[PDB]
Amino acid sequence: MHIEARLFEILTAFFALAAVVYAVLTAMFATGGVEWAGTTALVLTTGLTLITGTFFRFVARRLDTRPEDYEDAEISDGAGELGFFAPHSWWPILISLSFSTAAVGAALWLPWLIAAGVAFVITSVCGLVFEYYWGPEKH
Amino acid sequence: LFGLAADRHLGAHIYDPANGGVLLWQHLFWFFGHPEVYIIALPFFGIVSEIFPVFSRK
Amino acid sequence: QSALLRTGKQLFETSCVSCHGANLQGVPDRGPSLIGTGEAAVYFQVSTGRMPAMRGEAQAPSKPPHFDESQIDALGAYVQANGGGPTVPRDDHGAVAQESLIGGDVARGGDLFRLNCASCHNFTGKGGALSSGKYAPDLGDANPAQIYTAMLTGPQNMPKFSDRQLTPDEKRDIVAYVRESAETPSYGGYGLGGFGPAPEGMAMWIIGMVAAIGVAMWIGSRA
Amino acid sequence: SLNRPNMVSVGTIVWLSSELMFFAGLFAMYFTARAQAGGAWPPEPTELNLALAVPVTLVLIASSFTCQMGVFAAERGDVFGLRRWYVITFLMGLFFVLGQGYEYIHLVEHGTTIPGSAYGSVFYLATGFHGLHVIGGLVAFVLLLARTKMSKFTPAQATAAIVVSYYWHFVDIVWIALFATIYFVR
Amino acid sequence: WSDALALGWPTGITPEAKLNRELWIGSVIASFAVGAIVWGLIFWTSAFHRKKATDTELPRQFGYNMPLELTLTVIPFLIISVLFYFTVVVQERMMHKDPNPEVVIDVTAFQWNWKFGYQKIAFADGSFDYDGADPERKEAMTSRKVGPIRGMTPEDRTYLNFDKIETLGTSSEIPVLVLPAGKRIEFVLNSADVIHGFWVPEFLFKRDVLPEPKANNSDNVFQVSEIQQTGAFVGRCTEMCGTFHAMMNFEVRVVEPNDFKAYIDQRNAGKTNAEALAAINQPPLAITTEPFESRRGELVP
Ligand SMILES: CCCCCCCCCCCCCCCC(=O)OC[C@H]1O[C@H](O[C@@H]2[C@H](O)[C@@H](O)[C@H](O)[C@@H](O[C@H]3O[C@H](CO)[C@@H](O)[C@H](O)[C@@H]3O)[C@@H]2OP(=O)(O)OC[C@@H](COC(=O)CCCCCCCC[C@H](C)CCCCCCCC)OC(=O)CCCCCCCCCCCCCCC)[C@@H](O)[C@@H](O)[C@@H]1O
Ligand SMILES: CC(C)=CCC/C(C)=C/CC/C(C)=C/CC/C(C)=C/CC/C(C)=C/CC/C(C)=C\CC/C(C)=C/CC/C(C)=C/CC/C(C)=C/CC1=C(C)C(=O)c2ccccc2C1=O
Ligand code: HEC
Ligand code: HEC
Ligand SMILES: CCCCCCCCCCCCCC(=O)O[C@H](COC(=O)CCCCCCCCCCC)COP(=O)(O)O
Ligand SMILES: [Cu+2]
Numbered sequence: 001m002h003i004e005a006r007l008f009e010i011l012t013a014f015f016a017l018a019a020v021v022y023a024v025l026t027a028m029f030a031t032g033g034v035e036w037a038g039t040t041a042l043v044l045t046t047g048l049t050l051i052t053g054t055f056f057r058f059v060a061r062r063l064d065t066r067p068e069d070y071e072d073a074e075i076s077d078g079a080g081e082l083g084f085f086a087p088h089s090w091w092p093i094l095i096s097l098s099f100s101t102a103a104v105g106a107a108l109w110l111p112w113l114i115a116a117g118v119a120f121v122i123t124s125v126c127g128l129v130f131e132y133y134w135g136p137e138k139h
Numbered sequence: 140l141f142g143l144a145a146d147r148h149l150g151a152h153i154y155d156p157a158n159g160g161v162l163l164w165q166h167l168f169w170f171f172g173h174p175e176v177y178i179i180a181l182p183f184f185g186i187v188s189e190i191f192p193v194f195s196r197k
Numbered sequence: 198q199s200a201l202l203r204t205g206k207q208l209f210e211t212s213c214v215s216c217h218g219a220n221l222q223g224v225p226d227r228g229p230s231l232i233g234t235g236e237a238a239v240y241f242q243v244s245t246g247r248m249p250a251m252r253g254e255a256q257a258p259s260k261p262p263h264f265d266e267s268q269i270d271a272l273g274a275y276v277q278a279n280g281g282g283p284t285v286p287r288d289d290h291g292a293v294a295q296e297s298l299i300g301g302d303v304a305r306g307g308d309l310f311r312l313n314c315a316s317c318h319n320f321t322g323k324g325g326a327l328s329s330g331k332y333a334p335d336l337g338d339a340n341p342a343q344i345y346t347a348m349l350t351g352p353q354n355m356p357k358f359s360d361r362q363l364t365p366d367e368k369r370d371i372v373a374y375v376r377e378s379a380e381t382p383s384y385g386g387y388g389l390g391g392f393g394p395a396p397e398g399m400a401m402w403i404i405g406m407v408a409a410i411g412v413a414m415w416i417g418s419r420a
Numbered sequence: 421s422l423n424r425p426n427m428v429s430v431g432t433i434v435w436l437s438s439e440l441m442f443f444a445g446l447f448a449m450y451f452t453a454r455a456q457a458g459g460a461w462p463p464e465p466t467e468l469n470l471a472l473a474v475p476v477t478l479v480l481i482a483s484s485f486t487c488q489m490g491v492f493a494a495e496r497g498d499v500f501g502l503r504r505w506y507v508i509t510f511l512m513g514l515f516f517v518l519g520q521g522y523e524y525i526h527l528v529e530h531g532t533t534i535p536g537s538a539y540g541s542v543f544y545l546a547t548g549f550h551g552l553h554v555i556g557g558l559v560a561f562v563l564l565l566a567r568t569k570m571s572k573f574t575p576a577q578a579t580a581a582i583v584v585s586y587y588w589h590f591v592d593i594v595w596i597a598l599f600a601t602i603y604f605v606r
Numbered sequence: 607w608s609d610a611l612a613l614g615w616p617t618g619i620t621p622e623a624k625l626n627r628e629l630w631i632g633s634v635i636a637s638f639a640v641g642a643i644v645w646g647l648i649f650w651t652s653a654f655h656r657k658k659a660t661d662t663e664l665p666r667q668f669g670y671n672m673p674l675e676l677t678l679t680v681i682p683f684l685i686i687s688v689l690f691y692f693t694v695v696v697q698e699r700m701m702h703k704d705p706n707p708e709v710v711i712d713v714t715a716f717q718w719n720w721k722f723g724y725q726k727i728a729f730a731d732g733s734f735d736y737d738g739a740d741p742e743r744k745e746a747m748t749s750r751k752v753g754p755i756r757g758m759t760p761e762d763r764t765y766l767n768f769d770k771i772e773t774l775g776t777s778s779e780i781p782v783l784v785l786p787a788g789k790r791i792e793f794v795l796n797s798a799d800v801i802h803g804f805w806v807p808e809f810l811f812k813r814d815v816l817p818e819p820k821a822n823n824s825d826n827v828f829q830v831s832e833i834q835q836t837g838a839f840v841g842r843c844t845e846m847c848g849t850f851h852a853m854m855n856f857e858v859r860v861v862e863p864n865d866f867k868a869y870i871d872q873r874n875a876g877k878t879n880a881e882a883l884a885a886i887n888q889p890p891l892a893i894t895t896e897p898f899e900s901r902r903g904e905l906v907p
């Protein structure tokens with residue numbers, strides 16, 4: 001998977017160039033100092049792309065060509081076993097409601113509502129994560 | 140937004156004019172604002188880019 | 198001091214003139230006249246942050262103060278020289294009195310509060326709702342001078358208590374009660390807000406019953 | 421043979437890359453407030469001690485090793501080694517949190533608060549948001565350790581352990597940047 | 607014709623405005639050209655390339671043209687380059703700030719009104735000198751154990767400027783600023799609470815009035831080379847500042863160079879603004895704007 005890796009480092013080069021240009025051009029003939037606000041953002045924008053690019057490069061070097069990365073590939077090559085997907089769940093709405101409660105608490109500065117919201121969020125996330133792992137009832 | 144909520148609710152000095160915070164907000168906001176207006180442009184370029192070839196027989 | 202009466206005038210014409218006028222006579226349908234209100238009103242309104250206001254709604258809220266002590270005094274003195282009125286009590290050093298306003302009799306202050314002040318506020322000085330968009334605030338943030346000057350002026354929809362209706366000895370007892378009822382710990386556990394049946398009911402439903410049902414579900418079976 | 425990318429890992433990588441831009445705001449505020457300092461950047465009441473921030477940093481740097489050892493145990497099929505190493509990691513993280521809290525109390529006592537100054541605001545905001553991320557990581561440890569005993573140890577559980585390790589290696593790498601930029605570059 | 611291609615800009619009253627108008631007109635023409643080209647291209651294919659009644663055999667399937675995507679990517683670069691050059695040329699001129707102005711104005715914006723103060727006057731003919739700075743009154747804005755920001759509380763207000771002659775606006779009287787014609791003018795902008803907008807349309811310019819220009823690394827002082835028109839011109843606020851953002855207008859009245867001295871003397875005697883303009887045969891109140899009704903609106907008795 002080389003195209004995926006290249007797409008990120010292409011951006012990384014431009015971002016690095018832009019950050020370096022902005023930092024220097026501001027140090028001289030620009031009122032004040034180095035304009036720390038805009039300089040900080042671009043030097044982390046480069047990092048965002050760098051992390052993903054490096055990870056993709058390593059993954060691409062690890063594994064060989066896939067049917068997706070092959071020009072003259074057949075449909076019969078990909079036949080087999082995809083994996084696991086959740087068919088249905090009513091937990092997401094509960095998570096959203098919990099977060100909404102916490103947010104409303106934080107907006108009007110009601111600490112009790114914030115605490116209740118945090119407890120609800122933890123419970124809902126626990127419910128979501130422990131969904132396809134609960135065993136049968138023991139009796 | 141978290142910084143602004145901190146100022147409003149905890150009485151912090153993040154965006155104080157004396158602190159050089161009138162223009163901190165503008166930098167932080169316009170780093171978001173313009174990429175935001177390009178977020179709602181490209182997908183709708185793609186829609187018309189899909190529609191054009193179909194009705195042109197080309 | 199005339200050096201203080203002119204520094205308070207230049208602060209006024211830059212911050213107050215839009216809603217109150219250049220001659221303190223009031224701008225129609227925008228703000229009232231400030232003749233005869235005194236420096237007690239100025240102290241209460243500016244120290245608590247209510248002034249300068251930002252828009253015309255049901256009730257002007259409190260917020261962080263705009264000026265400091267020196268500027269507050271300057272503004273108060275400028276206003277006092279334009280029609281008289283009440284004055285903020287001072288101490289032996291000329292500073293605003295805080296400790297000397299605390300009364301000795303808290304039992305008399307308690308039932309004076311219960312008769313005169315517990316209708317709008319709570320039993321112990323929480324909030325209370327009024328007609329339409331208005332309310333009586335929480336009293337846990339005010340200092341003695343602010344509590345004293347609140348009733349001396351009748352700020353917005355709170356009635357006005359003169360020095361003949363409530364003498365400056367009953368006021369001290371009231372402020373003592375207000376300051377004590379806000380800084381005393383709860384006995385018997387977490388205060389639960391201090392409103393009574395409503396927080397108690399919600400705490401019951403959200404803690405006790407949840408725990409009981411959880412325990413029942415653990416002990417019992419399904420299907 | 422393995423011939424596919426783990427998408428549970430690529431999802432967490434892209435999210436972790438996005439989460440780096442959240443701290444951009446905090447860094448920008450710090451550097452902006454530092455510029456308008458004039459004289460001494462840490463004001464007169466502020467006195468930073470290296471007698472407490474150094475051991476805590478070392479502990480937070482020793483957690484990664486244990487975390488990676490747990491991950492190494494996960495890839496072999498060992499369910500007990502993972503549990504042992506993750507418990508140790510949790511304890512070290514808790515030590516970090518308690519140390520940071522103690523330092524907060526000490527700093528507040530001497531007159532360095534959020535409404536007190538412009539330095540206090542940025543300091544507490546940055547370090548408090550980092551503490552919040554750490555607490556989230558601890559919660560993740562507890563949830564994963566609770567899940568590891570619900571069912572048989574399948575590859576999916578190993579994947580979950582690996583992604584949690586990724587997250588942890590993102591809370592301690594952003595603290596070596598903060599520590600370097602606060603206590604050394606003053 | 608400049609009355610149709612300017613898209614309704616006012617004619618300038620200053621050299622900079624007149625220079626800016628030229629660049630605007632030129633840019634509008636250069637944009638309508640490409641607009642017409644592209645519209646013609648779109649219209650051409652929508653009227654001739656259509657489905658015919660006797661039409662089968664789907665058309666030629668071409669989708670690539672190498673020596674046309676490299677040609678059409680070069681012309682816009684050349685178009686924008688010249689525009690960039692002219693933009694730089696004009697922008698460098700509008701921000702010159704000659705060391706020796708002839709009148710300095712202290713403009714302060716507060717919550718929904720203005721105040722103008724004459725800092726200093728020094729004519730080039732050596733026929734009028736005046737120094738209106740007042741540091742004693744300025745000293746009375748200072749705040750302070752340590753302070754939050756650089757050893758002081760947010761209630762400092764030291765950065766403001768105070769002068770001996772100051773026109774102040776009220777909720778019932780539009781503030782009028784009086785300037786001489788044919789003279790170099792300063793404007794030094796400061797704000798007490800929030801950001802405001804200094805716009806005089808006839809100047810073809812505007813600048814933000816900030817609460818701390820120095821601390822925020824932003825220039826808050828511009829010059830006008832000279833004004834060659836006597837009369838009354840409008841100004842209004844162009845930055846969101848609250849409920850009465852739309853109700854804080856002002857006026858600038860430019861008079862003959864000799865009348866300016868008479869007005870200054872009248873103000874020095876102790877007369878107000880309305881009592882000074884009347885002294886030089888001028889209407890006392892604004893003629894471009896009038897005070898807004900103080901009532902909330904037409905649903906109120
Ligand atoms: C299973 C078994 C059963 C379980 C039983 C549970 C009970 C556990 C109890 C543990 C406590 C033990 C010690 C004894 C109590 C104690 O020693 O007392 C401390 C003091 O404390 C308060 O003083 C605050 C300051 O200290 C003062 O400086 C300040 O003055 C004061 O201000 C008041 O007074 C001013 C003067 O006028 C006013 O200006 C001002 O407005 C205000 O009124 C302060 O009060 P306050 O604002 O209440 O906030 C306090 C702080 C912190 O408090 C503390 O220290 C300790 C607090 C301990 C409480 C522990 C309770 C456990 C609950 C969980 C944490 C919540 C999660 C549950 C959700 C569901 C479960 C999951 C499914 O914030 C919080 O987080 C509050 C706690 C939040 C949780 C409690 C209940 C939430 C219920 C949710 C309902 C909503 C549902 C919505 C659905 C839509 C006042 O009470 C004082 O009297 C009191 O003296
Ligand atoms: C008949 C009548 C009076 C009804 C009025 C209905 C009404 C208009 C309600 C408005 C409530 C709110 C939240 C107003 C703000 C505007 C707003 C955001 C509206 C909802 C928007 C919306 C639909 C969004 C999505 C939904 C969502 C994410 C959640 C909403 C937030 C929630 C769930 C909050 C409401 C819960 C609620 C009203 C509970 C109050 C009940 C009680 C008894 C509280 C009183 C109480 C007090 C006062 C304490 O001090 C206290 C202190 C310590 C412990 C406990 C308590 C305690 O319980
Ligand atoms: C400049 C900083 C000031 C000062 C010193 C004060 N104000 Fe205001 N104010 C406005 C309105 C509509 C009211 C009446 C309703 C209410 O009280 O909210 C007030 C009230 C006052 C008072 C109370 C006087 C009384 O009669 O007891 C005082 C002492 C006061 N103000 C001082 C409106 C405005 C306003 C327009 C939006 C502006 C600006 C200010 N106020 C500013 C100031
Ligand atoms: C109903 C009307 C009442 C009565 C009988 C009392 N108060 Fe209170 N009060 C009321 C309102 C609507 C307001 C808000 C006005 C404003 O914000 O402009 C207030 C305000 C106060 C305050 C100041 C707020 C603070 O800073 O917390 C205090 C200290 C106060 N009121 C106290 C008080 C006392 C001691 C009273 C009886 C003696 C009293 N009030 C009566 C509403 C009402
Ligand atoms: C609003 C988001 C801001 C989060 C920043 C995290 C702050 C870390 C705590 C550090 C303690 C320092 C306190 C101090 O010196 O000043 C203290 C005041 O600070 C606080 O009250 C902090 C409470 C913040 C709430 C915690 C997080 C909010 C949860 C929201 C979830 C959605 C004391 O100052 P003072 O005595 O008034 O001078
Ligand atoms: Cu844009």
Ligand SMILES: [Cu+2]
Pocket residue numbers: 715718719801802803843845846847851854
């Ligand atoms: Cu304005």
Ligand SMILES: [Cu+2]
Pocket residue numbers: 801802803843844845846847848850851852
């Ligand atoms: Cu405006």
